[PDB]
Design a protein around this ligand. Sequence first.
Ligand SMILES: CN(C)c1ccc2c(-c3cc(C(=O)NCCOCCOCCCCNS(=O)(=O)C(F)(F)F)ccc3C(=O)O)c3ccc(=[N+](C)C)cc-3oc2c1
Length: 293
Amino acid sequence: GIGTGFPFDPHYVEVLGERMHYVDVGPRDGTPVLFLHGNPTSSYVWRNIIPHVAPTHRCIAPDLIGMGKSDKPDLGYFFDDHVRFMDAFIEALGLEEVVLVIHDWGSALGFHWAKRNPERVKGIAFMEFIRPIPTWDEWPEFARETFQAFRTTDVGRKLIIDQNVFIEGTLPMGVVRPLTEVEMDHYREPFLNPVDREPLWRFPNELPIAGEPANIVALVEEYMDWLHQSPVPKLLFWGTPGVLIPPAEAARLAKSLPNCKAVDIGPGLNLLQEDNPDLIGSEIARWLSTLEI
Ligand SMILES: CN(C)c1ccc2c(-c3cc(C(=O)NCCOCCOCCCCNS(=O)(=O)C(F)(F)F)ccc3C(=O)O)c3ccc(=[N+](C)C)cc-3oc2c1
């Protein structure tokens, strides 16, 4: 079955006075492959995809500041915090040229970074990424009312911060197949203390839906406009029915994004990695071998 363990030796690096944990496996030489997770996960969401790439390429999977095994300072955990921390992390590791493998809010970080440093990105494999959703009618019907309540400071915080609803409910509801008690416990681990759950609430409140918030909408429209023109090699993973990328959206992205290969992973919601890790990791390795890296 799908692996439930996290057998990776811990690595840490001082970043802006804060310690950040990351996975680092694979051959020391060659172009590194940087794995970026999102809400509400960690490098744990990559545990079954990294082993397909580690035999031949260096694999770096950090835990975003405030999540996973990284330090958890008292911050708002706005997207701009994660941008400052991820920019410094990359420079603290001395990474020159990289290939990106990104998902959810890690895709926002990855796309925003690649647009500012397109000389250092040899390829992007992305899935269930962040794009400007123009209307709430584009969000799945089964999750509208809840995510609307999430984007308030009274009901949203009570649900997500006090009652841990994003871990206990929203995370299972983003995977088609059922998560095991071991897997739930891994995702629960960085957030047993309710105060440490700020990022779980700030991320859905940063989601560019229906024109708000205007600044995130503007930033994401910028890297979407770069994506539509840049020749950078592109690998899109999508599934049915999806959440952020519905199948109809993926088909247009496959026809409009230059240098783009799309791959139907089957049934899927948001955490595609948990529904078909074997196809995603095996397809990333195959695609990697076609890059000038
Ligand atoms: C185990 N088991 C299947 C469930 C299922 C549901 C629940 C629910 C539950 C959850 C929801 C709920 O989460 N709805 C919304 C689902 O969301 C699907 C969309 O995917 C988002 C993927 C993430 C995308 N990333 S991101 O955020 O950066 C973004 F989007 F990009 F910005 C709604 C109602 C209920 C309910 O019981 O009325 C619980 C509610 C309360 C609770 N108590 C107070 C402890 C425990 C709950 O326990 C549950 C357990």
